Amino acid sequence: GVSEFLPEDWKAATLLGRIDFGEGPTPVLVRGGRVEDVSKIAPTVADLMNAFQPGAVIPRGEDKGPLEALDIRPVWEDPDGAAPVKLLAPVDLQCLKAAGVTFAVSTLERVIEERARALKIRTLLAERMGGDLKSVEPGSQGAQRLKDALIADGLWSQYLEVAIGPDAEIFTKGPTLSSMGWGDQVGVRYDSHWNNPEPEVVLLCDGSGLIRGAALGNDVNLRDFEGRSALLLSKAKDNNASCAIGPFFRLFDETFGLDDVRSAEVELKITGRDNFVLDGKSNMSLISRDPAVLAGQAYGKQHQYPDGFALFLGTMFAPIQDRDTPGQGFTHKVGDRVRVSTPKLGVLENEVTTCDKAKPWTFGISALIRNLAGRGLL
Amino acid sequence: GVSEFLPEDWKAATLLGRIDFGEGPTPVLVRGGRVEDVSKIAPTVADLMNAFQPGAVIPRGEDKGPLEALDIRPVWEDPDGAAPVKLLAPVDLQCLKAAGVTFAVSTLERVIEERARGDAGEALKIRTLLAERMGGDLKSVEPGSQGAQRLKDALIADGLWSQYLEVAIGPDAEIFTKGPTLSSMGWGDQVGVRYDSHWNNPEPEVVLLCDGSGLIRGAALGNDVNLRDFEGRSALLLSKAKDNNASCAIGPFFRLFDETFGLDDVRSAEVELKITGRDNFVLDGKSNMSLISRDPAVLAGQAYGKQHQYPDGFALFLGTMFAPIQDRDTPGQGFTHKVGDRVRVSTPKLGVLENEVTTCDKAKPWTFGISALIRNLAGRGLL
Ligand SMILES: O=P([O-])(O)O
Ligand SMILES: O=P([O-])(O)O
Ligand SMILES: O=P([O-])(O)O
Ligand SMILES: O=P([O-])(O)O
Ligand SMILES: [N+]
Ligand SMILES: [N+]
Ligand SMILES: [N+]
Numbered sequence: 001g002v003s004e005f006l007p008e009d010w011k012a013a014t015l016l017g018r019i020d021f022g023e024g025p026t027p028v029l030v031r032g033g034r035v036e037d038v039s040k041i042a043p044t045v046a047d048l049m050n051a052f053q054p055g056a057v058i059p060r061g062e063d064k065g066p067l068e069a070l071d072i073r074p075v076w077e078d079p080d081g082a083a084p085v086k087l088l089a090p091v092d093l094q095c096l097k098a099a100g101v102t103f104a105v106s107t108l109e110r111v112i113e114e115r116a117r118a119l120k121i122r123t124l125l126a127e128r129m130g131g132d133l134k135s136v137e138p139g140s141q142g143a144q145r146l147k148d149a150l151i152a153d154g155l156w157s158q159y160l161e162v163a164i165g166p167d168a169e170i171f172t173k174g175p176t177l178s179s180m181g182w183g184d185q186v187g188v189r190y191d192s193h194w195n196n197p198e199p200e201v202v203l204l205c206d207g208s209g210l211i212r213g214a215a216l217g218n219d220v221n222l223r224d225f226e227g228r229s230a231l232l233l234s235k236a237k238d239n240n241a242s243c244a245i246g247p248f249f250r251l252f253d254e255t256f257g258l259d260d261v262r263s264a265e266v267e268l269k270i271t272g273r274d275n276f277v278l279d280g281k282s283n284m285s286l287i288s289r290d291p292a293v294l295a296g297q298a299y300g301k302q303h304q305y306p307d308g309f310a311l312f313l314g315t316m317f318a319p320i321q322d323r324d325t326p327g328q329g330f331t332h333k334v335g336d337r338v339r340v341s342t343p344k345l346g347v348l349e350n351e352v353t354t355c356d357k358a359k360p361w362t363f364g365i366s367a368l369i370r371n372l373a374g375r376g377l378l
Numbered sequence: 379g380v381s382e383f384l385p386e387d388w389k390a391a392t393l394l395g396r397i398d399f400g401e402g403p404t405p406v407l408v409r410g411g412r413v414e415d416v417s418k419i420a421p422t423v424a425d426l427m428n429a430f431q432p433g434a435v436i437p438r439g440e441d442k443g444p445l446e447a448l449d450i451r452p453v454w455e456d457p458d459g460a461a462p463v464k465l466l467a468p469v470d471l472q473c474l475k476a477a478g479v480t481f482a483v484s485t486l487e488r489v490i491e492e493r494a495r496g497d498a499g500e501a502l503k504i505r506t507l508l509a510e511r512m513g514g515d516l517k518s519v520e521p522g523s524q525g526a527q528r529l530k531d532a533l534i535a536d537g538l539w540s541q542y543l544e545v546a547i548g549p550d551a552e553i554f555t556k557g558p559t560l561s562s563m564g565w566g567d568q569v570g571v572r573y574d575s576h577w578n579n580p581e582p583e584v585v586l587l588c589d590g591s592g593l594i595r596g597a598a599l600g601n602d603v604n605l606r607d608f609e610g611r612s613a614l615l616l617s618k619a620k621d622n623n624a625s626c627a628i629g630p631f632f633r634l635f636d637e638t639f640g641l642d643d644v645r646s647a648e649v650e651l652k653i654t655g656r657d658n659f660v661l662d663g664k665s666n667m668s669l670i671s672r673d674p675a676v677l678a679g680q681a682y683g684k685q686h687q688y689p690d691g692f693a694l695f696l697g698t699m700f701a702p703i704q705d706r707d708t709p710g711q712g713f714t715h716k717v718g719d720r721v722r723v724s725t726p727k728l729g730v731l732e733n734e735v736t737t738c739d740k741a742k743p744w745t746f747g748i749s750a751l752i753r754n755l756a757g758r759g760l761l
Binding site for chain 1 (some may be wrong): 541550559560611612685686689744749
């Protein structure tokens, strides 16, 4: 069932992704429900977005027929890759960037509720800032007053700095071409004991720093590493198969735009072999920094991205549901299936294993170059 | 002129890098003091390293003449790029990785900036407390050992523990992405400090070249341009403190390991830092790689393995050996960059990496990425 991970109105949508039809990764546009191989128009997704700015007509690629007729199978049904067609992550040459601590209200309230083990705390804090904590504006003067009041209470932390300060937390999620897509295995380090998915929306940005579309993401996260030291953030975020993006980027058009991202309800479901089930659901409406503002902090006068970039927008999901150890929260088991979904983008589903058991990352930039050159696409 | 930034024995060395002769980036070897265009052997440095294993002789490329005869000029003598030949960063497709707090002088200054919340005006008082309290304890254990665990417990009981000490002496080194692939500056380039940073510094380092099998192939010098006010405000701003336009420099070339040069030379390298400014500030200092807390091969083995691969290879900054605190403008306020600063990182076996500092917004933007490289190579018939 291919149709089950697509947006509800996907035949009216413009989807952009990558498919291996048997000869290597191929940029595809899905329009009118039909797949177009656009590799002769541009050999990569990054190249396509740079060749056709917003507002430009993208010509038609080679007809590959209806999308739901392609024999696409996920890894948990097709371990050996018997399928004649493989769906890939919809990024290729883009840098993989991620924002974190973008939902500042829940960060603040979790700090307060940890201190309370609350009314008096929220009262004095809101009066120093000059308004309700639910209205905190990161990087504002009210946020500076809140910062100082929190330093005075002994509640300040480096996480609150990126929650309400002028600079958002933005980091490199993984190397270019290393992302997993729909139906792939994702990896948690074998030496991580406390880890979780992070259900997110991922923006697609072109080499001019313009937002072009959005996909779902799983920012696989190793809590025990980051908890020992924030300087292990990279090691908690960037390992073999630790990034999943997909199934397609949905491009902005008459049917879909950034305002639909701004109000998207993102759902998470984790299903284990042990019959564990976890559900979580969170609205992008509560994000404390606008997606365009986050993109503008990643890209501007002081950082460019000539091949474009993808940007995870962060999450307010908290992995506090106990699984097997009371008090310590969630952690993955091998074989967990993780679904991240939202109606306008479809469903990103992956299966969890450890980083050493997932297939190694072998198809890098040089591998792509040789593949594209051998096909005459350059 | 050109020999001033090369190894003292450079005509006997094997140097690997990238030059634009006027048609685009070209992998080159410098052997016998002569430049070889090896683009017909492999179109990129990353491909060259994946095609020839360590110890295998790389065949001769196309002779381009003596290196010192090429009209190579740095940006402070050629601001508009009139020179017909340009030396580039010696990396192309490699990921740019960096290790942190591998030298005790850096570890102490990280804890100081953390306690100051990135405020340079607080550093003097905090340094006065912490240098005395923690002096001589960091290098008393091997990182990741049982001894290091007992030291951690002592420091926690002292009220001296920090998330930076966790990566200084714990089992997991701090390794992060310094910048995107193809974004590095090289010798003679401008490097960029963010214009909204007011507490920043160069970070001289030795940079390993590793291939797609994780093997260490050679070494270059590096400058990990760093923003203390950003990282001090929050370690979650590490990436913003490290990764901005033109914030990474590697060069002048990678010296490949052979009979004249090996990892043991990397392990004992004396590195010199010189900073000069338009205000006639001068800083000059030296330190030795033997002070590193984790062996370079151990750092490379933490970066690459069963849980992270790098099919195009990677460069690895080994960690800064300097943390400048010399007062520039105000007594007790320490150092920060000004536009026009010249930073020279040098060691006898590798030469000199020299850059001119400006702000990120004034440096030329990063425009030549992966697609540009692919198009350039394809158009030259090199694929
Ligand atoms: O290219 P857009 O119109 O989908 O953003
Ligand atoms: O807000 P900025 O300085 O990250 O653009
Ligand atoms: O922790 P640092 O040394 O990478 O700033
Ligand atoms: O990791 P660094 O900041 O010492 O280069
Ligand atoms: N588009
Ligand atoms: N920024
Ligand atoms: N460091």
